[PDB]
Amino acid sequence: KIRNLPWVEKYRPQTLNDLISHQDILSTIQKFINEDRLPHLLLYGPPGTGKTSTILACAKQLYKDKEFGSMVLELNASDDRGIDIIRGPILSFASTRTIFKKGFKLVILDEADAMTQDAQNALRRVIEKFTENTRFCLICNYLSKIIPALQSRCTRFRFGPLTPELMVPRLEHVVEEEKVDISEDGMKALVTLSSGDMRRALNILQSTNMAFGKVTEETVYTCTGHPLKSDIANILDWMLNQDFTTAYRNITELKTLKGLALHDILTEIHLFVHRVDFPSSVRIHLLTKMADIEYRLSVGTNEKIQLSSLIAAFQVTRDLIVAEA
Amino acid sequence: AKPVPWVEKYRPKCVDEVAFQEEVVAVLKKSLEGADLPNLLFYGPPGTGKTSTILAAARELFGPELFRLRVLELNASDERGIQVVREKVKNFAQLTVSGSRSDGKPCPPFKIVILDEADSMTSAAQAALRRTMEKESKTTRFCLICNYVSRIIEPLTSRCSKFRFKPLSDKIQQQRLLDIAKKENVKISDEGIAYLVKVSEGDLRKAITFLQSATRLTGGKEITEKVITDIAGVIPAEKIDGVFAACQSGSFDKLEAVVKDLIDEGHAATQLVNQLHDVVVENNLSDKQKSIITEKLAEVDKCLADGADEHLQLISLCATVMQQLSQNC
Amino acid sequence: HYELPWVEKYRPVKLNEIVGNEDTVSRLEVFAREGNVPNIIIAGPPGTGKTTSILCLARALLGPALKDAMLELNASNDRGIDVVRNKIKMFAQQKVTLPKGRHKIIILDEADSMTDGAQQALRRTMEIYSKTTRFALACNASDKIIEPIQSRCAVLRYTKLTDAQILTRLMNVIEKERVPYTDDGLEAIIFTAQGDMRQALNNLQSTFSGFGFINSENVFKVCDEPHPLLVKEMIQHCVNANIDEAYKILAHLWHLGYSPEDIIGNIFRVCKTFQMAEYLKLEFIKEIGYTHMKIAEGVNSLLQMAGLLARLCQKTMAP
Amino acid sequence: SLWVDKYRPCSLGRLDYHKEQAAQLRNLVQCGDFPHLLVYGPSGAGKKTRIMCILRELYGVGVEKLRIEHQTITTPSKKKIEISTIASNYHLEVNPSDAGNSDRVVIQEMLKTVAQSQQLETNSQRDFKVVLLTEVDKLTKDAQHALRRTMEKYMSTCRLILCCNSTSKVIPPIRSRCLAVRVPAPSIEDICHVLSTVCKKEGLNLPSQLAHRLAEKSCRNLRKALLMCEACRVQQYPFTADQEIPETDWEVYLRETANAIVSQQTPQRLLEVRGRLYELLTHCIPPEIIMKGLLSELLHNCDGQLKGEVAQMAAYYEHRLQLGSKAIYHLEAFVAKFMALYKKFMED
Amino acid sequence: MFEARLVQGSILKKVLEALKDLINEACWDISSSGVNLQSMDSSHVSLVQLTLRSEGFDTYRCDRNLAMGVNLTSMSKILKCAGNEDIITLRAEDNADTLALVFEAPNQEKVSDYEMKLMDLDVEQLGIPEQEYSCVVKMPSGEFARICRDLSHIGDAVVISCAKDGVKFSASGELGNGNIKLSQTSNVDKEEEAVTIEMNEPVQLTFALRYLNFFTKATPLSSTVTLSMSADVPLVVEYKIADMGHLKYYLAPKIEDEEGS
Amino acid sequence: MFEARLVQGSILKKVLEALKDLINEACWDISSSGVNLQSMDSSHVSLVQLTLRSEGFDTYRCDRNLAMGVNLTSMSKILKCAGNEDIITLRAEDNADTLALVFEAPNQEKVSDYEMKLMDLDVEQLGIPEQEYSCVVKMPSGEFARICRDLSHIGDAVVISCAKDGVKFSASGELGNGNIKLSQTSNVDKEEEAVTIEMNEPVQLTFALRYLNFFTKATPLSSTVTLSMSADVPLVVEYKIADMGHLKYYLAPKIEDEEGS
DNA sequence: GCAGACACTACGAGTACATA
DNA sequence: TTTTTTTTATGTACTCGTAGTGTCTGC
Ligand SMILES: Nc1ncnc2c1ncn2[C@@H]1O[C@H](COP(=O)(O)OP(=O)(O)OP(O)(O)=S)[C@@H](O)[C@H]1O
Ligand SMILES: Nc1ncnc2c1ncn2[C@@H]1O[C@H](COP(=O)(O)OP(=O)(O)OP(O)(O)=S)[C@@H](O)[C@H]1O
Ligand SMILES: Nc1ncnc2c1ncn2[C@@H]1O[C@H](COP(=O)(O)OP(=O)(O)OP(O)(O)=S)[C@@H](O)[C@H]1O
Ligand SMILES: Nc1ncnc2c1ncn2[C@@H]1O[C@H](COP(=O)(O)OP(=O)(O)O)[C@@H](O)[C@H]1O
Ligand SMILES: [Mg+2]
Ligand SMILES: [Mg+2]
Ligand SMILES: [Mg+2]
């Protein structure tokens, strides 16, 4: 049947084989499940890489639908996870048996970086004393916000960013399930603008399919509003090759016609700077000035003056690069 | 029969009345047709129409009788703590989707949670929205409205489909202002509407406010360019020429005199920074002088954004441009 | 029955099975053999064997009377101000018949979580009933335990386990489990352990379950290299104003998925104990804090970290 | 009553200066659909007088019947914070900066209960109420972010007139939602005309030289000019042209502080200047005005090639003072930087 | 259209008072047989099975089957202002979100229509094994409420044992031990106060006192309680209402470990 | 000089806490007919009239029309020090700025005297129009306090509808709508429960919950309460208290939504 | 049958701190 | 060889004092 769902939730890897990237980690967790030797897991990485979906597929593989409510205790940041919850419901779930069928239980603590340090210190002996009865899975995006005791007690798997070569078949599966007309440059634009994020890949795909009806490079870069790489090359050429007035006029006309934002222009110019064989002092000056301009855009500032400063940071270094020779 | 200001009289009551935001309007019209609406993130400059677009979309999706049952609006004028997200948002997200439109129009099978001004929401309260958005996506949708997307955490950025609201172009803004002036039976010259769409800088709310205030000040006759220039707080060009003459003189006493005259005349320092930048990028100065003057202008604009004193920032900017103008002399 | 993981399955049950800190563990063996153990506080890094040493000492001292003469309190318990007054003091007053040289042991594991008032109420019950009861404390941050409690106990400090000390226990686990291995795979396990026996056992069990063999490629396919081991040379390149190699290390850490907060935390951790000039270190730390305020404010991109690296390179060239 | 309060104009037709702006403000509020107002300008220009004249144009004479209303507002920390509001039967005057950093609670709770209820009488009163928010530049950005949706949801039954000195401290979401009304300071001729009409209404004779000196010394502040003119008539009833004008104590204390700065450049003199700045800060003088007075006095003793660097240092340390929370650190940092620069200039 | 009419208002008060600090939210499953409720607690340790028969209600009609998950803290506030001698009507439509509660005042003069917003939780059905038990004990509910309250003063976990002789309650605490052994109290004038042993095999298990004390707040529902115990299946506290249905309370045993010595 | 003497200590101990969180000051106006009090809330919503006639006092002396203002922050804490069934008197000199009240200490042995400073506030009498209301109804006192408490758990604003059948209290919230309909309670033994309707014109107005909860804190003073509603006149909550006078409340209605077709 | 006393839990209030 | 005090905005955790209230004792 059809459901009114976002494509990040309509297409979720309910089984472990539907995930794409981390094949060694998923194979090791599958061999943990098959041997019934599942340890305390610590899944960390950037968002959108498949940490929640992995443990949900593992929980559905370990437990049946008639025993899932008494075997899995899933708590996240939307629930209260204070120290009275660690001493209360979590300890009573860990220290007791099951109801229907005998087996080890699972405590899923999603977004474990948001927990307080008192709760994390109270979690240590609950994990250690009841290893035979229950298992604890900790999910976080920041490993520095989890205490080193819980990092020692749980074996850590890094769910790194998804490579664009592996995000193509899952996007093709979503495309062929949703009847989406997409070209090759549309797929390249999706996997370039995602930057190791499967969630925003499906979000950009759904928004581009609804906005235009076809997914090409121009439709993706128009719906997202991201500048094209030819536009960034033209901006760099104007900033490095002519005077202040003509570069200001050309960059202002390009930003007015294309409807560009200075944040993405700064990001792509920062990526272009390290590719250009600059002198070291010129590179340091450009990085400091671009970081200052990027910091200035986080408040109620005028974007035209910051665009002029972005032009100025290269108009200063024109003479230094040329006189370096 | 009470009068209403034109920003609320000409608020978009439907998606088709929203101007220039073509991609999100097409997405919302597809959601009106019955397509799968994802979680939305609206960001951009003020006055571009982020709130009016989602309010028009919600009132077209649910209608008058189901707007109170399917739409929850939470903004910075009400308390949004961690407990408000844990209790008020989560219990609303877990409610059933029921109730049908009595006019025969189709109704989508979800609710809409509108979190306007998500910049002011704390990082702890934003972390509690993550599994609420993921688990309850079968029965509710979330629209986050903000101005700076860096003030929303990366999980909520990844969970929402981002739509950036561009500043309105001169053609679309001029067309909308001429339509509003046509419906209000007032007349405005072409130079007046050109200076209005130049002054408003893509802010359509500012343009509508200036048009209504110029109509009230004018009384009903022709709206010229002088009333627009006086009503916008635009500094005259003779003051800018006097500032640059005091900088070319190389004396700090005349610099203090023109800075005190501009401060005592009540001119805003942001308008002075904009006009000084417009003169600086369009003259016959060298590239290095223009470069460090524009960088000082950016620093002064950043300091004015953080609520520094206008007099000290303006005299520092004037000292810098005076040093640049008297260095080559 | 469900088999325990190798961290808990191969927990030592005698004090002679505990590797590392040979003098302190040997003195604990002597005190378990003879008796009359004083109050002790064992401090050190996680996974060193403090709780294992305390529990093995309590098992060797008490034996069959472990159920009635031992009180084990964790951070998962309450242990507030009213537990020290009404449960610890009542257990210290409790009459338990024990052999000569043996006292009741009140084990207060992870004493960092205990509040200041509870530790103030813990002093006189430590001092009065010491003829019949004893205290065994374990902690990580020993400064959180107050000075009067540390004066009332023999403060033991555990250091990080070396490569050979972890390697001996790993060889024992391998010979108990018949794990095929190579030398460089065990060196990779030691390198990923970083002085932690828990992480060594977890990485060994993960590599054995996922691949069935211990070489360097099977260890590094599931485990990871430690973070500050490359941040150290990134800071070294920032000292010599080498912005290109520092950005290469920064981009390599960025493409592995590390958040900017973790990267700048490792940068501050390296710069706190780096070997350079003191004034240069102070201005480096001030620049790190200035960038960390921007990261916590909301702006956190690769351009901000590159600007931080460029500012750290400038601070060298601006004496 | 003093001369600042006895001869204040009541309606827009009795204003001595900015008469074209007075006619424009009369034409603005006649129909009743006028938007939110942002009355801004220098202190003493006449912003509050024109706001009260706008309220006189909207409602009747009953807006002058003011009374003190005491409100108790509960923080999220459950600490009772007391604020005072001046209210009439037609409008309310709120200064949320009196609550300090808890002004966001005042905006979220006190203003929303005012806006959510319509007026009792709709015949003597009009269809909408006016809320006067005074010194909105001193509001934090959280309170201004809390302000913006109330300004759009209830703008048919509740209007807002915001008063401030600088619009740079007002966030662009608030500035986009309201019409900005600029009230400049009166000129020397305008202040001389006002003082001459006040002295003629008092039966006195005011010379043009004394009136010009009172206008020049007041720095185009008509309130301070009227106070100085009344002080000059209590001090000496024959208005001489070269009659001395009394001075404020904190201004001459700031001048002597800057003279102590330029007299000696030592850490001991820096400690003495820190004590003087502590004495200035304890008397509830704002630190930006301390920076402005220091820069106004230090640049008189500097050479022509040194003033720009001192002005840039003063702006930089005032920006760091606005970013920070302890003003004495940034004030002493600016004084120490000026002492180092002055010693380097004098020794070379 | 679902329309259930409570003949008495005291039973709905006494059911909800027992589940107030235990059941997170009420899952009313409605069919032609009656009203069912199988919901776990917040800690996923206890399970509550409630079955109200159709013949117990004053009037009961049900066209199509419904599953109306609703909040219980919201249901607690509307049941405090409910009389103990009046009829309460439960109403809900086919495709609506409002659960209507219509009753009378304690002053008995005004209607009181209390609507509740239904929740949309997707809860999987828990499979009750319905197997035999190695111990079945009939017991008064007043005595079972007293004994679990009396042993909460000594410890926090009770080692409740049963055999051919009778049920035995033990609680090892900080002060010491409290051992209660009651057997064969059927030789009294009343019929509710009786201890009857049905099954054979002895079983010793340890349970938390917090959940057992929550189970004893259903004491005014039934004058006699039934305890079921076995070595594998959990402990069942079966209340049987006289003319309305039955209530079952499940509680998992705690993990206990023998000393190595 | 002003001197008055009460007949019971509970006629001031039960009315002052109703004004404790409602109004910030208690302005007593002294006249030959009696003592008047008309104070308005700081939010310009609530308005309380309290007049006690001179015949109900034990004794009463009034030669000049004097008005005194005192704050609720200091008179509340000395009210709990005073007794319940003791006698209370109030004394005020003509020229002094001190209000002295003499009563009995709760040990019933010694004279306890407290002094309060007179706050000089320049207020004016608003003046009730005393117009004929569109609704007049009679409700019990103790039952009406239980009405507004029940709608306090639902929403922050209640809706009052008074047609010819009775008075309907409604509150639509995030939990669900709570509707009651008090009507036709004339067949009771006690005369204070006689619910009756004295007018014909219906009206529907919404009011704030918080001040109506403050209005129900003066309920044990009288046996009944009288409610008066109109189209634009504020709601009147009238208490006929004992024998010495009557108490009157006023509450401004809330805003109405733009529900035009 | 109704007034006084006993401990019971829920709730209001004050305070500290949050890193390596 | 030298010691007083309240500001930062939330969120959590701890600790202590207080007040309706269910239940028991008694004439
Ligand atoms: N490896 C993957 N393979 C396939 N789809 C994926 C993968 N990772 C993410 N997705 C998609 O993205 C959605 C969200 O994935 P999540 O598991 O929630 O990511 P996540 O790692 O949990 O990120 P955070 O840290 O929780 S915000 C899923 O429902 C899928 O549609
Ligand atoms: N795109 C638009 N089309 C039509 N009218 C618009 C548009 N944008 C703004 N307006 C008008 O200006 C008013 C302000 O629109 P908003 O939706 O509040 O803008 P905004 O994006 O919410 O600004 P911020 O960021 O909240 S301060 C609307 O009520 C309209 O009257
Ligand atoms: N010195 C050691 N010798 C042998 N095994 C050890 C040693 N240290 C740790 N282990 C193993 O690691 C497990 C955990 O050791 P613990 O003593 O519980 O850690 P810990 O020293 O208490 O550190 P924290 O601060 O409590 S995380 C033990 O069960 C052993 O399997
Ligand atoms: N048009 C005018 N004619 C005479 N006096 C004026 C006029 N406008 C302002 N003033 C005087 O100048 C002073 C300015 O103070 P105020 O009106 O509060 O403005 P601001 O709020 O800018 O200080 C007032 O005391 C008032 O008496
Ligand atoms: Mg997740
Ligand atoms: Mg908005
Ligand atoms: Mg330990």
Residue numbers in the entry:
A (entry chain C): 16 to 340
B (entry chain D): 35 to 363
C (entry chain B): 33 to 351
D (entry chain E): 2 to 349
E (entry chain G), F (entry chain H): 1 to 261
Can you list sentences taken from the study reporting this PDB entry?
CTF18-RFC, an alternative clamp loader, localizes to replication forks during the S phase and forms a complex with DNA polymerase ε (Polε). CTF18-RFC has recently emerged as a specific clamp loader for leading strand DNA synthesis. Proliferating cell nuclear antigen (PCNA) is the eukaryotic sliding clamp that functions as a hub protein and plays critical roles in many essential processes, including DNA replication, cell cycle control, nucleotide excision repair, break-induced replication, mismatch repair, and chromatin assembly. In this cryo-EM study, we reconstituted the human CTF18-RFC–DNA–PCNA complex in vitro and captured seven intermediate states in the PCNA loading cycle by CTF18-RFC, including an apo state of CTF18-RFC before it encounters a clamp, two states of CTF18-RFC bound to PCNA, and four states of CTF18-RFC and PCNA interacting with the 3′-ss/dsDNA junction.
States 5 and 6 represent post-DNA-entry intermediates in which the bound DNA drives the gradual narrowing of the PCNA gap to 12 Å and 5 Å, respectively, apparently via electrostatic attraction of the positively charged inner surface of PCNA to the negatively charged DNA phosphate backbones. The four CTF18-RFC–DNA–PCNA ternary complex structures (5S-binding modes, states 4 to 7) are similar in the CTF18-RFC region but different in the PCNA region. Comparison of the four CTF18-RFC–DNA–PCNA 5S-binding mode ternary complex structures reveals that CTF18-RFC is very similar, and conformational changes upon DNA binding are mostly limited to PCNA. Consistent with the similar CTF18-RFC structures, their nucleotide-binding patterns are the same in the four states (states 4, 5, 6, and 7), with a Mg2+-coordinated ATPγS in each nucleotide-binding pocket of CTF18/A, RFC2/B, RFC5/C, and RFC4/D and an ADP in the nucleotide-binding site of RFC3/E. From state 4 to state 7, PCNA-3 moves progressively closer toward PCNA-1, with the gap size decreasing from 19.9 Å (state 4) to 14.1 Å (state 5), to 5.9 Å (state 6), and 0 Å (state 7), thereby, transforming the PCNA ring from a wide gapped spiral to a closed but nonplanar cracked ring. Because the CTF18-RFC structure and its associated nucleotides remain the same, the observed conformational changes in the PCNA are not likely to have been caused by ATP hydrolysis by CTF18-RFC. It appears that the electrostatic attraction between the negatively charged DNA phosphate backbone and the positively charged inner surface of PCNA drives PCNA ring closure and stabilizes the DNA position in the ring. Accompanying ring closure, PCNA-3 gradually moves down and away from the CTF18 A’-domain and the RFC3 AAA+ module, reducing their binding surface from ~1,400 Å2 to ~200 Å2.
